[PDB]
Amino acid sequence: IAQARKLVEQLKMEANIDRIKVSKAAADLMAYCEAHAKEDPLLTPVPASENPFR
């Protein structure tokens, strides 16, 4: 009974949360991905002059 009471309390804690819209989280992820496009040596390969593993 105590275990189920703790489970109920945990669910209560989980329920009371402010959630943003999905269309906003996707926009934020797109903004972060686009703002760091020219910083990924795996996405846009760096020339061989600055590659430590040439």
Next chain:
Amino acid sequence: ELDQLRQEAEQLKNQIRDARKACADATLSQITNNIDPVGRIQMRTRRTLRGHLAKIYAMHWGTDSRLLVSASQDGKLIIWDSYTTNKVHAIPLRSSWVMTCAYAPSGNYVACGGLDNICSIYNLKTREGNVRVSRELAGHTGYLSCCRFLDDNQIVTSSGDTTCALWDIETGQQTTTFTGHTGDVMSLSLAPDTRLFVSGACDASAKLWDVREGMCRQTFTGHESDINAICFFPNGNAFATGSDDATCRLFDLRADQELMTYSHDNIICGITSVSFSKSGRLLLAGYDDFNCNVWDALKADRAGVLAGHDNRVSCLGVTDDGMAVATGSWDSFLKIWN
């Protein structure tokens, strides 16, 4: 009052489900429709590290993105200089059954653990020049699955007794015990600001814990089998999991729901490891079919394939500056790709 507790739990579950459902205006696959594809990603192997005589089970990169540590099932922890392929240290272990290894952010310590329910901390900066056991933590009743350093004095471990622990290396005593899972915890990932961490278990669930106070904040479900790997998005507001059903999934912390599913029809094996690139638009996942797949993180289509390992790709890592990818497999070879 079993009936009242059951009905309250069902009411809370339905309320949470309805609240999460009412927050999905569109889909991430719909918003990312007009963006340009990444194209074809062709990576070549630049180095091969040899010296392990058994299956490699774990690996970790250094903060400087030059030194790495690898653990295999022959009682040896080997520290490699990736630039020159040289061996810096070879630490013999008291137990040959190791399932995880970690590297301190400062670089002065290394951690190991496995079937023995003990986490061993080794010091790499001894005055005599030899590595010796600095600490041993033995408060777990199940095998250790993962361990990650917070500072030079703190470490978070996950075990097979459905619990996680936060330790104090100076005194060797537990500080916080994160309980709530109903299955063996397989993976563990720290937030970039080291104030939250996600843990995935064999009950097909993931939980978000806060290190300071020590309670579960959010629970994420949707997978069908055990979650073998977990990783944090570089921003820290999302994470990715990989399961035994040949599927990866992307979850958002603020939206509190799934975003995208990465799966194919020619893949039926399991995912052993996942990782993100520095920008965050590439997801690298190692499989049991001896291959590693690179997916576009914004459009759920495969972008590249890494092949060359004889056996299961057991461990995968990306350097902090994102210049190379290290993959370790059961054929006792580590390959660096760029």
Next chain:
Amino acid sequence: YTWNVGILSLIFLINVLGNGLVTYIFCKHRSRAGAIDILLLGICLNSLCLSISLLAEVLMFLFPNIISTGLCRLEIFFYYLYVYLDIFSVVCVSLVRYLLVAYSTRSWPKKQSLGWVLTSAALLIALVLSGDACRHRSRVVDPVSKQAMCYENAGNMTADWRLHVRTVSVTAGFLLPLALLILFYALTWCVVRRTKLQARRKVRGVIVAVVLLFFVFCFPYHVLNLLDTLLRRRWIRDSCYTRGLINVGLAVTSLLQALYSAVVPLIYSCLGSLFRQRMYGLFQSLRQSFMSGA
């Protein structure tokens, strides 16, 4: 005569494809290897001798006026080396297989170094006998064309023109290696039979096959050489019709030995289960890449 280089050409193709397959599969997994793998590689790197011999032979039909005393030797030396190195390496393979079984706990049989020294010893012996083989063959001057028929005959040397050659060849090639093969394989089987393993019925078949292939392919050439020698001594009456049959038999028997030397590298690897699995995996993966259909 045109057929001779035509038939020898097919042996070249079979040899290069088989040796290339064996070497390619070995190169993929060379981190773990014993003496047997090194010996098989040493057998594989005898195709150069056949290539040199075939290049020297093909110079007859086209560009035919290069031939000197050395060139017939330059053909015969590499041909005999390509023949003998196979025979001498097979005995070393059998010896290593005996050593592994007889001393399973010890670690010195498994070491790669051992094969190396064995791979050297055979390489020495195959040279020395080859040194004899070239010696008898001589440049030839003929009224029509000097080039034709590099022959063993010098001016007045009836006493030693073939009998030393064929006696040493048979004794060193087919009578000592056969005895050593039988001895080592019998010693291996003596300990294998005592075990309870299910594999006992497969090991016996493999041993019988490897001994029987060598015997069956090598024996007819020596039989026909002996028949030739007995013929030229007039111990048996010659109708002179037999001589054509005798020579045509000699040619086909030499061709049979040439084919055996080319084929054996693939046979030794194929009989092993691990090599079969490795080649099945290659045939699955590579063909699954191209002709996949994407």
Next chain:
Amino acid sequence: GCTLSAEDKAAVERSKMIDRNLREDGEKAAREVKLLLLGAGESGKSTIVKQMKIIHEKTTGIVETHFTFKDLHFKMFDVGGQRSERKKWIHCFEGVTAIIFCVALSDYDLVLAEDEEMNRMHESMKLFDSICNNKWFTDTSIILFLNKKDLFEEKIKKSPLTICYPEYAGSNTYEEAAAYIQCQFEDLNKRKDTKEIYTHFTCATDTKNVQFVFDAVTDVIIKNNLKDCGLF
């Protein structure tokens, strides 16, 4: 090689000396016999480690036992404290020389810990079936020990062989009731043409179990050498 400074070449020398020690230790470790000890409940697993000759060199998971017999080093691994999911770590023991499975003969009428109309022998049969017919154990040999052969000398004189294995008709005798249980434990092998199973009716004395283990593994070593030399 040549374009190396004083500090650079010392690292190469250190790496070469590390690799030399690593291959020395690997060659030393390749000569030991690793055995995995398994059982179902109170089927033994405790006296067997005592019968092992010359036992010679906290944790609550892996239990390691080292010993020597006739110039051979044996390491036995016991997994009794691992109550977690077996399928998540059983692949660690892939490459062990043999699996020693212990079964108590005096369990053909005893119910399980929780009374559920289940005999303690059927659980052993299921565990053996799962371990033997595993993807990670397709060529690993199994040494089967049937321990309590003396306790199977008084209950069998009273109790019949009908509580378990009801399709049995024969005399209540040690020979004809144990040669049947051995057959039922050997019929669960689905790779009878490749995998070998060694059965022994052990006791609490006579110290002859170590000889049986030595004789069983001295064929596994020969079989492995035969597989690595291309003769099979």
